[PDB]
Amino acid sequence: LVVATDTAFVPFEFKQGDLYVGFDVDLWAAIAKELKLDYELKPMDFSGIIPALQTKNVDLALAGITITDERKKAIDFSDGYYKSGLLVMVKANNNDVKSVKDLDGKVVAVKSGTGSVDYAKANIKTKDLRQFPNIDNAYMELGTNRADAVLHDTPNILYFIKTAGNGQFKAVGDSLEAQQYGIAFPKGSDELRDKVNGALKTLRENGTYNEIYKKWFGTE
Amino acid sequence: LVVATDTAFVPFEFKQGDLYVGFDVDLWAAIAKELKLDYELKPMDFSGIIPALQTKNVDLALAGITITDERKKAIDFSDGYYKSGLLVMVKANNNDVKSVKDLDGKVVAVKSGTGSVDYAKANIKTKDLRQFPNIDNAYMELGTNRADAVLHDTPNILYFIKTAGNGQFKAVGDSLEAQQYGIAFPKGSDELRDKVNGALKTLRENGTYNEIYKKWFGTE
Numbered sequence: 219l220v221v222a223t224d225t226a227f228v229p230f231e232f233k234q235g236d237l238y239v240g241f242d243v244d245l246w247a248a249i250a251k252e253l254k255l256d257y258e259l260k261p262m263d264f265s266g267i268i269p270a271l272q273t274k275n276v277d278l279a280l281a282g283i284t285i286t287d288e289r290k291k292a293i294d295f296s297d298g299y300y301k302s303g304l305l306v307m308v309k310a311n312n313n314d315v316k317s318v319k320d321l322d323g324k325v326v327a328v329k330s331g332t333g334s335v336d337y338a339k340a341n342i343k344t345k346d347l348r349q350f351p352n353i354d355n356a357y358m359e360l361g362t363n364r365a366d367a368v369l370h371d372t373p374n375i376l377y378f379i380k381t382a383g384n385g386q387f388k389a390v391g392d393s394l395e396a397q398q399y400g401i402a403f404p405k406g407s408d409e410l411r412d413k414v415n416g417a418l419k420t421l422r423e424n425g426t427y428n429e430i431y432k433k434w435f436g437t438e
Numbered sequence: 439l440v441v442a443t444d445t446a447f448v449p450f451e452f453k454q455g456d457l458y459v460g461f462d463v464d465l466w467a468a469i470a471k472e473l474k475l476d477y478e479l480k481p482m483d484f485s486g487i488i489p490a491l492q493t494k495n496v497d498l499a500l501a502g503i504t505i506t507d508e509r510k511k512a513i514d515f516s517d518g519y520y521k522s523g524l525l526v527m528v529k530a531n532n533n534d535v536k537s538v539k540d541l542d543g544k545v546v547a548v549k550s551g552t553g554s555v556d557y558a559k560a561n562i563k564t565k566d567l568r569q570f571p572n573i574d575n576a577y578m579e580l581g582t583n584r585a586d587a588v589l590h591d592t593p594n595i596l597y598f599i600k601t602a603g604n605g606q607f608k609a610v611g612d613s614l615e616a617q618q619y620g621i622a623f624p625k626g627s628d629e630l631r632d633k634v635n636g637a638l639k640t641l642r643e644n645g646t647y648n649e650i651y652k653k654w655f656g657t658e
Contacts, residue, residue, distance in 0.1 A: 248456075423467070425458040425479040438480065 219257035221246060222271075224264050224281040229377050229434045231261075231281070241434045242280040245299065246401075248426055252417040268292055271404050278403050278410070282373075285400040294405055296414050298398030299427075304334055307375045308367040309360065310388035317391045319367055320344060327356035327365035334369045337395055360387065372396075376435040389437075439477040441466065442491075444484050444501040449597050449654050451481070451501070461654045462500040465519060466621075468646055472637035488512055491624045498623050498630070505620040514627065515620035517635045519647075523613030524554055525595040528587040529580065530608045537611065539564055539587055547576035547585040554589035557615060577603070596655040 223231045223242060231240035238259060250257055260276065267283075270276040271293055284302065285295045308315045319326065320343030328334040330349045338347055348365065350356045353374070359365040368375070372393050379387050403411050421427045428438065443451045443462060451460040458479065470477055480496065487503075490496040491513050504522070505515045528534050539546055544564030548554040549572060558567050568585060570576050577598070579585045588595075592613045599607050623631050641647045648658060 419476060422478045423470070423476075424463075425481065426456050427478075428480065429453070429456050438482075 219255055219277045220260050220275075221257050222260045222262055222267055222276045222279040222281070224267075225261050227264075227282045229373070241300075241430065242282065244430050244433075246280055248421055248430065249414055249417045252420055253413055268402070271402055274404050278401060278407075278414075280401050282399055283402050284397050286397075289402075294403045294407060294411055295400030296403070296411055297418055298400055299418055300399035301393055301396050302372050302399060303393030303396030304337055304369055305372045305375050305393060306367050306369060306390045307360065307379070307387055308390060309363075310386055312388075315367060315390060317394075325364065325366045327359040327368050329353045329356060329370060332370075333395060334371075338369055341394075357383070373435065376437065380434075380436040439475055439497045440480055440495075441477045442480045442482055442487055442496045442499040442501070444487075445481045447484075447502050449593070461520070461650065462502065464650050464653070465641075465647075466500050468641055468650065469634060469637045472640055473633055488622070491622055494624050497627075498621055498634075500621050502619050503622050505618050514623045514625050514631060516623070516631055517638055518618035518620045519638060520593075520619035521613055521616050522592050522619060523616040524557055524589050525592050525613065526587050526589060526610045527580070527595050527599070527603075527607055528610055529583070530606055534587055535610055537562060537614065543586055545585045547573075547579045547588045549573045549576060549590065553591070553615060558589055581606075593655065596657065600654075600656040 223238070226232045227240075227242075229240050230242040231238055233239075238261065243259075262270070264281055267276075267279050267281055268289070271279060282300075283289075283295075285298060289295075306315070306317055323345050324342075325346040325348065326338055326342065326344050327348045327350065328338060330351055335349065338344065348356075348359065350359070353368070353370050356365065356368050356370070357378070360368050375389055379389060401414060418427075431438065443458070446452045447460075449460050450462040451458050458481065463479075482490070484501055487496070487499050487501060488509070491499055502520070503509070505518055509515070526534070526537060526539065534543055539562050541563070544562065545566040545568065546558055546562060546564050547568050547570065548558060550569050555567070555569065558564070566585075568576075568579060570579070573588070573590055573594070576585065576588050576590070580588055587610070595609055599609060621634060638647075652658065
């Protein structure tokens with residue numbers, strides 16, 4: 219089996235010295251061993267991934283791919299293996315928030331041009347809603363005390379808190395507007411899809427999914 | 439179904455490489471096969487379990503949970519699947535034999551602040567009740583014929599005898615002050631609890647209980 223991934227989608231897959239590492243990279247390996255499957259990893263630009271799948275130049279793919287409906291026209295997915303969505307981040311040493319942040323005097327920093335803007339325009343009465351060109355900017359805003367909270371995606375904030383905000387920040391609530399990631403197969407791959415799904419169940423039931431999730435995201 | 443356990447309660451559940459293993463984990467896996475349930479395992483700190491049961495944040499739990507009336511107030515319990523209580527452990531080459539640690543025999547090692555303190559005190563009339571910060575101090579006191587025997591709980595006795603007390607040690611009687619472990623459900627879960635009780639019968643009748651028991655505790 220030839221399985222394709224992104225060239226970098228931290229922390230799901232990214233080079234490390236000479237190998238690749240990440241949540242997707244550890245997840246597939248555990249599924250593969252449950253099934254006794256031999257395979258080969260082939261890194262390539264996301265843009266080439268549904269293409270190469272549809273011509274069967276590649277047998278499956280795990281590149282943090284979201285199960286959407288327009289995508290199901292083109293391919294098939296396994297069961298969801300990851301809950302993504304939007305997440306709230308505030309100062310760790312702040313005990314006054316949990317998606318309760320509007321007309322008390324509340325300021326949310328976001329990145330321009332993502333689902334975080336939208337959701338906040340609709341579901342929050344921010345005293346202020348600041349938009350930045352990059353999230354890094356948003357972080358430095360929370361860094362000082364101009365932003366009450368940041369709103370961005372689950373994996374990005376979770377992993378940030380683990381590596382670089384270690385110390386100072388904390389996330390609250392859980393995923394808003396949650397969607398799911400899925401393993402992509404070419405159509406007509408019904409048997410294998412069924413086999414992978416089956417193995418995904420086993421990994422949840424014996425606790426291997428949980429520990430892999432801890433390692434990279436640091437919570438449950 | 440989301441199924442929770444303790445983060446470490448040996449040998450009922452604990453982390454073996456990248457999964458979890460133990461008596462609870464195997465007995466539940468077998469009950470889930472009978473009824474064909476899909477489930478996710480989710481280790482957590484013990485004292486976060488009943489709270490999460492009560493909010494239906496979790497559907498059921500196994501974590502070596504003693505059935506107490508104090509607890510029935512808050513949650514509901516299945517038919518109970520593990521008989522616990524105290525056990526005398528003496529040297530192998532020895533002829534004490536029940537709780538006959540009395541009259542002229544008897545120097546009894548036991549840990550501070552524990553059922554065995556109080557059971558010996560009131561019951562056994564002996565030379566000594568030597569008490570210790572930890573039982574490891576009691577295993578050591580018995581190694582060298584300074585103590586005649588030890589009082590401690592059924593599974594810690596059985597498991598130590600199977601792993602580290604290999605051969606030199608042995609156990610005598612069976613459980614004193616018996617109490618049962620139960621699988622925990624949040625109330626208003628009548629249908630599922632009566633299903634889980636049923637599958638426990640099937641496993642006791644066909645021999646599977648007995649064979650899971652022998653695996654972890656080297657006896658019946």
